Design a protein around this nucleic acid. Structure first.
Ligand SMILES: [K+]
Ligand SMILES: [K+]
Ligand SMILES: [K+]
Ligand SMILES: [Mg+2]
Ligand SMILES: [Mg+2]
Length: 136
RNA sequence: ACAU
DNA sequence: CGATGT
């Protein structure tokens, strides 16, 4: 089982969990940063991981790219497969933004098609995903 | 347990 | 040490 180097890798970064959430996507081969989301003041690790995959899907579809996406998040991979982010985060005025983005990401999944393979990055075998923030 |  | 998730 080898790395598919012709791929996009995504990851969340946070200050606290729940806390400030951001995410980015990189070229797995080169590490070039292809997109970065502006920090969202409150969210969870898994909401951010989910938004990162969906953004990757949208980014690759817009560019007519058939590359797969790597994520290290078992949870977010399943949420994308299900088209449903089963987060426990309370809904209130401070979490409104992240929940709006998550709701809109689900809605995009429910209105668009893609063949993009969404693959588990095998951290145990390969080290940290190339999109990692270096904060652990 | 496993994945973050 | 705490948290988010299956
Ligand atoms: K990190
Ligand atoms: K990890
Ligand atoms: K746990
Ligand atoms: Mg991650
Ligand atoms: Mg990481």
């Amino acid at each position: 089982e080898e790395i598919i180097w012709e791929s996009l890798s995504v990851d969340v970064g946070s200050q606290g969990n729940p806390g400030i959430v951001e995410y980015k996507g990189v070229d797995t081969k080169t590490g070039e940063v292809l997109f970065e989301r502006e920090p969202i003041p409150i969210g969870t690790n898994n909401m951010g991981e989910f938004l990162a995959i969906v953004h990757g899907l949208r980014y690759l579809k817009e560019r007519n790219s058939r590359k797969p996406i790597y994520s290290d998040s078992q949870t977010a991979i399943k949420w994308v497969k299900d088209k449903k982010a089963k987060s426990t985060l309370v809904r209130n005025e401070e979490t409104a933004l992240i929940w709006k983005l998550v709701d809109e990401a689900e809605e995009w999944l429910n209105t668009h098609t893609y063949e993009t393979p969404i693959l588990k990055w095998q951290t145990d075998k390969w080290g940290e995903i190339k999109a990692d923030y270096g904060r652990k």
